[PDB]
Every structure is written in structure tokens, then in C-alpha cells.
Design a protein around this ligand. Structure first.
Ligand SMILES: OC[C@H]1O[C@@H](O[C@H]2[C@H](O)[C@@H](O)[C@H](O[C@H]3[C@H](O)[C@@H](O)[C@H](O[C@H]4[C@H](O)[C@@H](O)[C@H](O[C@H]5[C@H](O)[C@@H](O)[C@H](O[C@H]6[C@H](O)[C@@H](O)[C@H](O)O[C@@H]6CO)O[C@@H]5CO)O[C@@H]4CO)O[C@@H]3CO)O[C@@H]2CO)[C@H](O)[C@@H](O)[C@@H]1O
Ligand SMILES: OC[C@H]1O[C@@H](O[C@H]2[C@H](O)[C@@H](O)[C@@H](O)O[C@@H]2CO)[C@H](O)[C@@H](O)[C@@H]1O
Ligand SMILES: [Ca+2]
Ligand SMILES: [Ca+2]
Ligand SMILES: [Ca+2]
Ligand SMILES: [Ca+2]
Ligand SMILES: [Fe+3]
Ligand SMILES: [Fe+3]
Ligand SMILES: [Fe+3]
Ligand SMILES: [Fe+3]
Ligand code: NA
Ligand code: NA
Ligand code: NA
Ligand SMILES: [Zn+2]
Ligand SMILES: [Zn+2]
Ligand SMILES: [Zn+2]
Ligand SMILES: [Zn+2]
Ligand SMILES: [Zn+2]
Ligand SMILES: [Zn+2]
Ligand SMILES: [Zn+2]
Ligand SMILES: [Zn+2]
Ligand SMILES: [Zn+2]
Ligand SMILES: [Zn+2]
Ligand SMILES: [Zn+2]
Ligand SMILES: [Zn+2]
Ligand SMILES: [Zn+2]
Ligand SMILES: [Zn+2]
Ligand SMILES: [Zn+2]
Ligand SMILES: [Zn+2]
Ligand SMILES: [Zn+2]
Ligand SMILES: [Zn+2]
Ligand SMILES: [Zn+2]
Length: 636
């Protein structure tokens, strides 16, 4: 059965010999991937992510469904609380936070050479309308949200506030320098910077131009991941309830609702500006109450404070991407009593968001059916002037590439299925007509660009990989025009197993509710294809990544920028200075088992091809397991 396939894949993921996790005192921390040399969002395989933790929850929730044993889900939640939701030690000075003055504006710059970027006190910042309510609800000033990125094996050497120890995964961060700073162009740094490493002011003055530098901590949420963790717990509820075990997980449901309460920070403009036609940083007014809410799952929220006359700050984020939205989580938080937040306005906010996210997704639906990028309340991240005639959604501006422009953030087909699966899941649960309309146009488009290779057992199946967008939606006036002038074309295909599994699920949920037989046939062909690519530790297919940026210094537009005159060292002694490269500040990479093959290709790229690898990404391997489990959930 596929429930046999689920359990086989589950067992591989959880077998210590496979290498998916590091164990710390009985608790498991998943890696980004089994393989160490991987550069895509994290920049090392044995970093990990709040994403991975959300997928770890998902895997154990399906394990509960299948077996009735909910203790592995508890374990996974305990691990999250221990290692990636900052504890008091990690975020110690939230008492200094002033919600009436949440942050000082710093403009985002157009390229990495604009950093460090200065504080601007003449730009109005709004009031934060969440903080006092969260404190009153939970009895703490701390944030209950995952930080996005850990260094699980301490490959970078940061440790805990600079101590270099490897007793727990290190809290670290990379992206800091705006839209044009790719994964290849960051300077990894500790979230808690006591100046042990880096330059004389740690790493702080690569990023922020301030007259004084103080030791401080800061964290960043990945709302795509915290919303997925809530979505997982909706399902744990459902599946435990069918078993008469809903009581075994009632504490975990409480804690997911708490996560969801704090996740509202993602719904706000970065600097709590009023939403809509927010053009000119000194002109766009500060928000009052919830007029700074866009009610979408934006790219991040972040918070920090002095390590120590304490100061502290919080930001939302102004730009939202279709691939992050989670209408299933929004439905759960707004309408399922077991997941409704305890704060007096949490439920209302999530009910507004549920509605708003579905309108946003429909507004972004192209002529062909794919979902375009998103929209922002802060053009270019400095409240800049967008082009005249640019499309709008609730006064925000259409952005075909929200947040990341290296690469354009919505060119990956993966975000289509990550969003769409959640839309399909809603449609399965409630029959939501709004979800159904999106799906009825998207599903054919996706099917039309999928090849399950049925006559050949899925050996050479293919799913969409890279998308090319053009045009813009019509401005939203509360009705779908069909967006005849917003276009997408598929320009590359892959065998990406993670994307495959999410596509298969999307199609299955949709088929279950609609009865659509073409959708189910495609899904079934994709699941066969996955089974055809089993190996000892999971399911994997060949990929051939590119590596040519690893040795690129700054050339005036691309490569690793360091400010003239700036000098510092990484924990291993690697020199951070002008003319450094991705590799030169990550010199440990030269000991990686893949390194010789990478360098041999870069030495002679006409004659030595780039290595072809078969990678085991945690999230992808879980995605697969969940696709197998979903099949039997939906179809027996
Ligand atoms: O007034 C009392 C004293 O004030 C002191 O000045 C303080 C001031 O009070 C305070 O407000 C100010 O706070 C700023 C911080 O210094 C600054 O570091 C922080 O920068 C944010 C930045 O705005 C934001 O865009 C950036 O977002 C990154 C994020 O870090 C990163 O994790 C995320 O990555 C995502 C990946 O892109 C994605 O692929 C993945 O899936 O998810 C990741 C997570 O979402 O990407 C985003 C966007 O690129 O985060 C940084 C923080 O890391 O901004 C604060 C507010 O402006 O600090 C001042 C100190 O300079 C005075 O010094 C003193 O005189 C006063 O008395
Ligand atoms: O940034 C979104 C997700 O990217 C995932 O990596 C993708 C990558 O972007 C593609 O170019 C291709 O390489 O496939 C990868 C695996 O699907 C990354 O693994 C996730 O962590 C990100 O959320
Ligand atoms: Ca220290
Ligand atoms: Ca760049
Ligand atoms: Ca229909
Ligand atoms: Ca190069
Ligand atoms: Fe050190
Ligand atoms: Fe509750
Ligand atoms: Fe301008
Ligand atoms: Fe086509
Ligand atoms: Na319990
Ligand atoms: Na509670
Ligand atoms: Na089959
Ligand atoms: Zn085993
Ligand atoms: Zn039990
Ligand atoms: Zn417990
Ligand atoms: Zn706990
Ligand atoms: Zn190891
Ligand atoms: Zn219930
Ligand atoms: Zn219940
Ligand atoms: Zn509506
Ligand atoms: Zn094959
Ligand atoms: Zn492309
Ligand atoms: Zn209308
Ligand atoms: Zn079947
Ligand atoms: Zn194969
Ligand atoms: Zn194989
Ligand atoms: Zn193979
Ligand atoms: Zn093969
Ligand atoms: Zn190549
Ligand atoms: Zn190459
Ligand atoms: Zn290359």
C-alpha cells in the first residue's frame, strides 16, 4: 500500500544511519539535507531551518495518523522549543521594547554596496498594535516564533553568543543587504553578536550605519514555516480526533495557536506604516491601530534588542509572496476552536487574513493559470515611487519578484505547489468556492506541463521548474478579470522530488473533492515515478547545480561586497575584506567531499562537466512521505 510506502520512507528519514538529523540529549534536530555542499537558501547542508522543523512536525503528525502514537510529534515540538524558538537567554531584553516606537527606519538599498545603511529619524514609524496584547495574553514580553536559520554542526564556529561551542545549534543569519544580495553574496553572522568575531563591532557595521554600536541580538521569522507548523497541527487535530485521541495533543494545539498569534507580526508593514499608496518615506504616515495591517503572510517579521540602558525593536515586513500564503492555516486559526488564538483580536485578524489571502491569490492568477508574485507596501524597500500605472491590491503595488531579485523570487515552480497544495487542502476540507475557482484554472495548467512518463514507469518523468513572468494583473477592484495581460511560461523542467510530491498532493486533494479524473491520473503517475527512484536513504533523482559564483569577488554589481576599509575575521580566521569571495569566507568548504568535483569542473568547464548529484533535502523527503500518506488518507 501507499501507507507501506509512507512507513518505509518515514523509517529511512528517522534511521540514524541515513544522517537526516543530529541528536542533542534525546531530541532531534533535522539538517537542511543529508549532503553538506548545497547552496540555495541556506548555504550549507547542515545548517537547518524553521522550514525543516515545520516539515519534521508534518512527518510526525502523519506518523500519528497512521499509528496512533503522538509522542514523536511531542518530541518534535519539544525540539523546536528547545533549539529554534529563542529562549530567554537568546532574547533577553524584550522589556525595553516600546510598542509606541517600534523601530527606527533604515532604508533598504538597491545593491549590497549601499550597506551599511543609515538610520533615518525623520521617517515616521507607526505604533505596533500587537505587542501589549500578546504580553497580556501570554504573560511574557518574549516572541513565540521560530528563528529561520541554525548552524546545526557549528560549521561556522559561532556557538552561543560568540562562544564557539557546539552544545546546541547556533542561531545565525545571512541575508541583510537587500534585493540584490543572493545566497552567494551574504556574510554569515551570529544572531547574538557580542563582538567576539567579525570586526571591532562584530558584524553589525557591515549592515547598519550608526554612530554607536552595541552588543545585541536579533532574530527573523520565516512565516511560510510558522504557518506550515500551524497547518500541520490542524491536521494532527483532525487525525487524533478520528482516533478519539484528540486529548493527547491538546497542549500542542494550544502552542500552535500561540505561534499563530505571534505570526500576526507578518501581517504588518515593516515599519507599521499605514497601508496603501505608501509612497515617500517621510510622507507615508505612521500607522495607528491596525491601519498598518496588509493581512497577508509577508516575507518576514524580525525583532531584536541590546545585550546591555536596554533598547529593543520589532518590524513586520511590507512585501508578500503568493508562495507563502496559507489559506488552510488561516482557516484553522480563524474557525477551528482548537486553534483559535487566545488574544482578544487574534481570531478577527486571522479571519480578515483568510479572506484577504484568497482575494490576493485570485488577483495574482495569470491568463495561463499560474499565480504571479505578490505585492508590497514599500516599493524597493524604501517606500520608493513605483512606475505609473502599476497594478495595485488594497493600495499595495504588484511585484513580479517580491523581496529577492537574485534570483527573481517567483520564478521557482515550487512556490506554485506549496501554495496550491494548501488551497487544495482547504477545498478538500470545506469545498470553499473561492479555492475551487483558483484550482479549476490552475490545475489544468499544471497538468499540461507535467509528464509522468507513464509508458516507462515514470523513469523520465518531468515537472515544471523555472517560470518566466510578464505583464501584470489588472488592478484589484474585488473581481477577477481573467488577467489577460499577466502571463507566465514554463522555461525549464526537472525531476525535483520535493516539487513532485507537492504537485501530486495538490492534485489528489483537488481530485478527492472535485471528482476530477485527469487530476487523479496525473497524481497517481507522479507517485509511481517517486517510487521508481527509491534509494537506500530516501527517494532521489539527478540534479546538476551551478557553482560559478563561489569564487567571484565584487565587480561593482555582483559578487561578495565588503565595505572599503572594513576588516574582520570569521571564527575560523577567514579574512572578511574587500576582494573576498563566497568561498574565501567559508574556507571549510574545501574539505567537503564534493569539493574536488566542483573545483575540477570550474577548472575546465568545457571538458569536465559539473557534478550530477542525488540530494536528500529533509523537506523534500518529508514531502514525499506525506504524499504517500495522503494517498491512503484520501483514497484508502
Ligand atoms: O533608541 C534607542 C537607541 O536606538 C539605537 O538604534 C537602534 C534602533 O533603536 C533599532 O530600531 C535599530 O533596529 C534595526 C537593526 O539595527 C537592523 O539590524 C534591523 O535590520 C533588519 C532589516 O530591517 C531587515 O530588512 C532584515 O531582514 C532580512 C532578515 O534578517 C533575514 O533573516 C531574511 O531572510 C529570509 C530569507 O530571505 C528567505 O529566503 C528565508 O526563507 O527566510 C529568511 C527569514 O525571513 O531576509 C530579510 C529581508 O532581507 O533583517 C534585519 C535584522 O536582521 O532593522 C532594525 C529596524 O530598523 O537598531 C539601532 C542600532 O543601529 C541607537 O543606536 C541608540 O543611539 C538609541 O539610543
Ligand atoms: O527559496 C525557496 C526554496 O528553495 C529550495 O531550494 C530549491 C531551489 O530554489 C531550486 O533552484 C532548486 O535548486 O530546487 C531547490 C530544491 O527544491 C530550498 O530547498 C528551500 O529551503 C527554500 O524554501
Ligand atoms: Ca560570548
Ligand atoms: Ca547580486
Ligand atoms: Ca469546479
Ligand atoms: Ca566564478
Ligand atoms: Fe571563536
Ligand atoms: Fe486553545
Ligand atoms: Fe526614488
Ligand atoms: Fe505551455
Ligand atoms: Na500530550
Ligand atoms: Na493558550
Ligand atoms: Na500506481
Ligand atoms: Zn532502519
Ligand atoms: Zn500512545
Ligand atoms: Zn509536553
Ligand atoms: Zn513544550
Ligand atoms: Zn557530520
Ligand atoms: Zn476540534
Ligand atoms: Zn477537537
Ligand atoms: Zn473578500
Ligand atoms: Zn529515472
Ligand atoms: Zn529563468
Ligand atoms: Zn467584488
Ligand atoms: Zn491510488
Ligand atoms: Zn532514479
Ligand atoms: Zn536511482
Ligand atoms: Zn538516480
Ligand atoms: Zn537514474
Ligand atoms: Zn553548469
Ligand atoms: Zn559550470
Ligand atoms: Zn558552474
Amino acid at each position: 500500500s501507499y501507507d507501506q510506502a509512507f512507513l518505509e520512507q518515514y523509517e529511512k528519514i528517522k534511521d540514524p544511519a541515513s544522517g537526516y538529523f543530529r541528536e542533542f540529549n534525546g531530541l532531534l534536530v533535522p539538517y537542511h539535507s543529508v549532503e553538506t555542499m548545497i547552496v540555495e537558501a541556506p548555504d550549507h547542508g547542515h545548517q537547518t531551518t524553521s522550514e525543516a522543523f515545520s516539515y519534521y512536525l508534518w512527518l510526525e503528525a502523519y506518523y500519528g495518523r497512521v499509528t496512533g502514537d503522538w509522542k514523536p510529534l511531542h518530541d518534535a515540538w519539544e525540539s523546536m522549543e528547545t533549539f529554534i524558538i529563542p529562549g530567554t537567554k537568546d532574547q533577553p531584553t524584550n522589556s525595553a521594547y516600546n510598542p509606541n516606537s517600534p523601530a527606527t527606519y533604515i532604508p533598504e538599498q538597491p545593491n549590497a554596496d549601499g550597506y551599511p545603511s543609515p538610520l533615518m529619524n525623520n521617517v515616521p514609524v507607526g505604533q505596533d498594535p500587537l505587542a501589549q496584547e500578546l504580553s497580556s495574553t501570554y504573560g511574557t514580553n518574549e516572541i513565540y516564533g521560530m528563528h529561520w536559520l541554525l548552524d546545526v554542526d557549528n560549521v561556522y564556529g559561532f556557538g552561543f553568543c560568540g562562544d564557539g561551542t557546539d552544545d546546541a545549534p547556533a542561531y545565525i543569519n545571512t541575508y541583510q543587504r537587500g534585493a540584490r544580495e543572493s545566497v552567494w553574496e551574504t556574510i554569515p553572522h551570529p544572531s547574538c553578536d557580542d563582538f567576539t568575531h567579525g570586526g571591532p563591532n562584530g558584524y553589525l557595521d557591515l549592515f547598519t550605519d550608526d554612530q554607536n554600536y552595541a552588543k545585541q541580538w536579533r532574530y527573523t521569522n520565516a512565516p511560510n514555516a510558522d504557518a506550515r507548523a500551524v497547518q500541520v497541527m490542524f491536521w494532527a487535530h483532525e487525525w487524533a480526533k478520528e482516533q478519539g485521541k484528540e486529548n493527547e495533543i491538546a497542549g500542542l494545539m494550544d502552542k500552535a495557536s500561540k505561534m499563530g498569534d505571534y505570526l500576526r507580526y507578518a501581517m504588518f508593514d515593516k515599519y507599521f506604516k499605514k497601508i496603501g499608496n505608501c509612497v515617500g518615506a517621510t510622507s507615508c504616515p505612521g500607522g495607528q491601530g491596525k491601519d498598518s495591517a496588509h493581512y497577508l503572510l509577508s516575507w518576514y517579521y524580525s525583532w531584536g534588542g541590546s545585550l546591555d540602558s536596554a533598547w529593543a525593536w520589532r518590524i513586520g515586513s511590507s512585501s508578500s509572496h503568493q508562495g507563502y500564503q496559507n489559506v488552510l492555516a488561516a482557516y484553522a486559526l480563524s474557525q477551528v476552536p482548537e486553534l483559535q488564538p487566545d488574544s482578544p483580536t487574534g481570531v478577527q485578524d486571522w479571519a480578515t487574513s483568510f479572506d484577504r489571502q484568497l482575494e490576493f491569490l485570485q488577483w495574482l492568477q495569470s491568463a495561463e493559470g499560474g499565480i504571479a508574485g505578490g505585492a508590497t507596501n514599500s516599493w524597493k524597500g524604501s517606500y520608493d515611487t513605483p512606475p505609473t500605472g502599476l497594478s495595485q491590491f488594497y493600495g499595495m503595488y504588484y511585484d513580479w519578484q517580491p523581496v529577492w531579485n537574485d534570483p527573481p523570487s517567483n520564478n521557482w515552480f515550487g512556490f506554485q505547489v506549496w501554495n496550491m497544495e494548501r488551497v487544495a487542502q482547504l477545498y478538500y476540507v470545506t469545498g470553499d468556492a473561492r479555492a475551487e475557482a483558483i484550482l479549476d484554472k490552475w490545475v489544468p495548467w499544471a497538468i499540461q506541463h507535467t509528464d509522468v512518463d507513464a509508458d516507462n514507469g515514470g523513469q523520465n518523468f518531468q515537472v515544471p521548474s523555472d517560470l518566466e513572468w510578464s505583464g501584470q494583473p489588472d488592478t484589484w477592484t474585488g473581481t477577477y478579470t481573467g488577467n489577460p495581460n499577466l502571463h507566465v511560461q514554463v522555461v525549464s523542467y526537472s525531476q525535483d522530488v520535493g516539487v513532485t510530491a507537492a504537485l501530486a498532493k495538490t492534485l489528489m486533494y483537488y481530485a478527492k473533492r472535485s471528482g476530477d479524473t485527469t487530476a487523479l491520473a496525473t497524481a497517481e503517475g507522479l507517485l509511481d515515478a517517486l517510487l521508481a527512484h527509491r534509494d537506500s536513504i530516501g527517494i532521489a533523482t539527478p540534479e546538476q547545480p551551478s557553482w560559478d559564483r563561489l569564487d567571484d569577488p565584487w565587480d561593482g554589481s555582483e559578487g561578495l561586497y565588503v565595505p572599503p576599509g572594513w576588516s574582520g575575521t570569521m571564527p575560523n580566521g577567514d579574512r572578511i575584506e574587500p576582494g573576498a569571495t563566497f568561498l574565501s569566507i567559508r574556507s571549510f568548504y574545501k574539505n567537503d567531499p564534493l569539493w574536488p568535483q566542483v573545483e575540477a569542473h570550474l577548472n575546465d568547464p568545457q571538458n569536465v562537466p559539473a557534478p550530477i548529484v542525488e540530494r536528500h533535502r529533509f523537506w523534500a523527503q518529508v514531502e514525499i512521505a506525506t504524499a504517500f500518506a495522503a494517498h491512503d488518507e484520501l483514497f484508502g
